[PDB]
Amino acid sequence: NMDVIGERIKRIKEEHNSTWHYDDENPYKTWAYHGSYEVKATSMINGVVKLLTKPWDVVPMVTQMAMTQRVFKEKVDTRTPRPLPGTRKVMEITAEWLWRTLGRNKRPRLCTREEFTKKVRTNAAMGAVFTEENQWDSAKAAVEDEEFWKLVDRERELHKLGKCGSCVYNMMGGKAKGSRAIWYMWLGVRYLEFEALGFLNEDHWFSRENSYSGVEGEGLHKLGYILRDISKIPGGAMYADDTAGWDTRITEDDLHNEEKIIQQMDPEHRQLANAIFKLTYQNKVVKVQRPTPTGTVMDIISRKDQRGSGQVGTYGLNTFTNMEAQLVRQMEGEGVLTKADLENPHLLEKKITQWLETKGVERLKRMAISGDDCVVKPIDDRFANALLALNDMGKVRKDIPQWQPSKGWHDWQQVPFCSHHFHELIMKDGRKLVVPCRPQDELIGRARISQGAGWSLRETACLGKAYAQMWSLMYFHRRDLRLASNAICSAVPVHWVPTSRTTWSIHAHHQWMTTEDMLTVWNRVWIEENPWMEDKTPVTTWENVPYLGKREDQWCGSLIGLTSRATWAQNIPTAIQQVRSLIGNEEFLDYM
Ligand SMILES: Cc1oc2ccc(NS(=O)(=O)c3ccc(Cl)cc3)cc2c1C(=O)O
Ligand SMILES: Cc1oc2ccc(NS(=O)(=O)c3ccc(Cl)cc3)cc2c1C(=O)O
Ligand SMILES: [Zn+2]
Ligand SMILES: [Zn+2]
Numbered sequence: 001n002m003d004v005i006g007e008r009i010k011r012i013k014e015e016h017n018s019t020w021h022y023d024d025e026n027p028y029k030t031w032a033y034h035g036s037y038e039v040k041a042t043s044m045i046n047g048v049v050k051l052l053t054k055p056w057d058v059v060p061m062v063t064q065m066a067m068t069q070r071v072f073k074e075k076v077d078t079r080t081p082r083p084l085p086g087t088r089k090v091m092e093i094t095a096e097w098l099w100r101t102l103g104r105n106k107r108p109r110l111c112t113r114e115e116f117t118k119k120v121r122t123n124a125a126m127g128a129v130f131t132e133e134n135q136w137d138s139a140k141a142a143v144e145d146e147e148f149w150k151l152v153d154r155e156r157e158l159h160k161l162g163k164c165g166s167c168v169y170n171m172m173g174g175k176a177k178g179s180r181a182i183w184y185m186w187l188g189v190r191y192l193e194f195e196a197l198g199f200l201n202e203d204h205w206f207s208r209e210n211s212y213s214g215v216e217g218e219g220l221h222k223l224g225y226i227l228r229d230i231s232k233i234p235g236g237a238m239y240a241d242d243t244a245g246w247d248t249r250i251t252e253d254d255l256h257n258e259e260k261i262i263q264q265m266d267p268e269h270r271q272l273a274n275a276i277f278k279l280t281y282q283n284k285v286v287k288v289q290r291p292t293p294t295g296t297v298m299d300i301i302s303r304k305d306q307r308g309s310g311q312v313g314t315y316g317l318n319t320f321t322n323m324e325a326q327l328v329r330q331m332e333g334e335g336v337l338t339k340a341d342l343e344n345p346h347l348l349e350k351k352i353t354q355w356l357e358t359k360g361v362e363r364l365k366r367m368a369i370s371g372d373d374c375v376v377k378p379i380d381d382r383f384a385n386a387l388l389a390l391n392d393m394g395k396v397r398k399d400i401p402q403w404q405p406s407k408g409w410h411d412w413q414q415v416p417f418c419s420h421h422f423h424e425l426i427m428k429d430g431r432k433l434v435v436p437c438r439p440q441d442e443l444i445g446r447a448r449i450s451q452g453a454g455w456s457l458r459e460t461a462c463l464g465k466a467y468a469q470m471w472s473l474m475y476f477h478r479r480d481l482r483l484a485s486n487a488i489c490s491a492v493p494v495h496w497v498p499t500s501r502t503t504w505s506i507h508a509h510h511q512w513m514t515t516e517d518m519l520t521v522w523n524r525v526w527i528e529e530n531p532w533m534e535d536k537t538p539v540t541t542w543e544n545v546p547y548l549g550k551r552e553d554q555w556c557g558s559l560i561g562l563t564s565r566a567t568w569a570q571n572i573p574t575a576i577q578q579v580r581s582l583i584g585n586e587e588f589l590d591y592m
Pocket of ligand 4: 421
């Protein structure tokens with residue numbers, strides 16, 4: 001093991017030779033511990049959103065979010081039992097077939113310094129781009145620096161030689177302030193993963209068109225429609241089981257299966273991806289910021305299995321592995337795989353290959369898969385109790401005894417997916433919309449959080465305006481959110497550009513980051529560009545933009561019907577005016 005990780009620990013040890021020591025009392029049980037060294041340390045409430053959402057002031061979920069994968073929890077420090085030999089064979093056959101299916105039209109390729117620089121710059125507009133970004137360590141600054149690219153080249157040369165000298169990721173046990181040199185090693189490590197494996201996201205290998213089960217690039221506004229289209233396929237209930245800490249359940253077998261994509265690469269690409277897989281994915285070196293009685297320390301730990309949650313390519317490889325694990329469960333449900341097949345070290349391929357070649361693509365079309373998140377509509381309900389391979393692969397379902405059957409839904413609208421459920425709304429003109437929805441306390445609680453501190457009223461109001469505009473595009477069908485959205489947009493200067501991100505979700509397309517008229521953006525998203533909207537007649541007024549049924553709105557967290565809500569709705573112009581007075585002499589517009 002030290003042959004692959006030695007150089008990295010050696011360099012960390014050398015750079016921190018003053019405070020370096022081996023703590024005999026380290027909390028690590030399943031991660032190899034190498035040593036520690038001394039280190040430094042360091043969310044505000046959005047007063048604009050808070051002032052305009054008074055009824056939610058002390059509401060439990062909202063108050064919780066104000067305080068509250070990157071964290072090194074108890075579950076990260078566990079081992080997953082090794083899958084059985086027949087299970088390992090099935091996974092290998094399925095991984096091989098899946099990669100060949102996913103690569104039928106696309107060819108893997110290297111991603112570039114220019115692609116990375118463009119992504120950094122375009123996302124730097126929305127504030128922070130990375131977890132390691134300080135007020136001194138800007139990704140935009142680093143990307144503009146030729147010295148950063150020189151270090152990248154030097155690390156690549158080591159990777160070409162089958163060695164790694166500086167590729168490390170970080171975890172939380174008040175982020176430690178480090179050197180520009182340390183930050184460059186981190187960003188360079190991310191660029192090198194991006195160069196070798198970024199094609200998966202950049203070339204949309206997991207788009208629905210390319211992967212059948214995938215939803216990458218679709219957007220939150222299409223997710224409900226995809227679930228409604230899956231509902232039309234004949235079969236059993238729709239299952240959406242949650243895996244307890246998916247990333248900790250990624251086995252050495254899963255890692256070796258994900259690696260098979262290198263077989264489709266050109267030699268110069270194959271060489272660099274092979275180095276990312278073998279040296280960094282299969283031999284992780286992690287820095288964990290741990291508090292001690294004297295001060296704060298940084299632990300240098302390492303391990304072979306599990307998913308490096310901090311590493312580029314995680315989404316795609318998680319999506320790949322989940323698609324694979326769900327096909328295997330589908331096969332077990334269909335009686336293709338028995339307990340005796342999973343235990344068998346000489347399991348015959350014929351029937352697994354036959355099922356994949358004849359039913360595989362149809363079976364992928366029955367799923368909506370986004371990383372560890374899955375919705376499956378099997379051919380019948382034998383799937384509910386087909387748990388032998390799922391548990392054996394290590395994908396143990398969250399908060400349910402291992403052998404208790406899964407509970408599915410017979411209504412796609414009850415199905416949870418990507419932190420949402422989706423409703424079908426009838427418009428006054430008879431056209432139907434399929435909208436995303438989540439508990440309202442979660443949306444308001446999120447909107448009340450400002451990312452960091454020292455943010456001026458102007459920057460704060462603009463984040464609020466971004467949240468308000470997201471609500472008008474995605475959550476317009478919630479009475480309280482449309483009202484709060486209209487109040488926020490009325491209180492914030494009309495020509496001020498919404499800045500900073502509202503969400504880090506892969507499904508967010510940020511159509512709300514504009515000064516363009518929200519009704520126009522709404523029409524473009526839900527009517528013009530909506531493929532499930534056959535009649536393109538534009539909606540000319542918000543009065544024609546529908547709401548959830550009163551009962552469904554209330555069930556999903558609405559405060560409508562309460563006195564505190566009625567009082568808020570009536571007194572809202574007063575709160576808007578107060579926000580206006582503090583912002584000052586600017587151009588405002590009344591949206592109430
Ligand atoms: C673990 C992690 O996942 C991310 C997922 C997305 C992002 N942000 S980013 O704008 O979208 C992005 C996404 C991909 C790449 Cl190569 C660069 C930057 C950052 C992280 C991150 C981290 O900074 O540590
Ligand atoms: C916009 C966006 O959100 C994400 C949310 C998650 C991910 N997953 S990712 O490959 O695993 C990843 C992991 C770590 C880092 Cl630093 C960047 C990206 C990627 C993106 C992404 C992108 O453009 O690549
Ligand atoms: Zn490296
Ligand atoms: Zn709802």
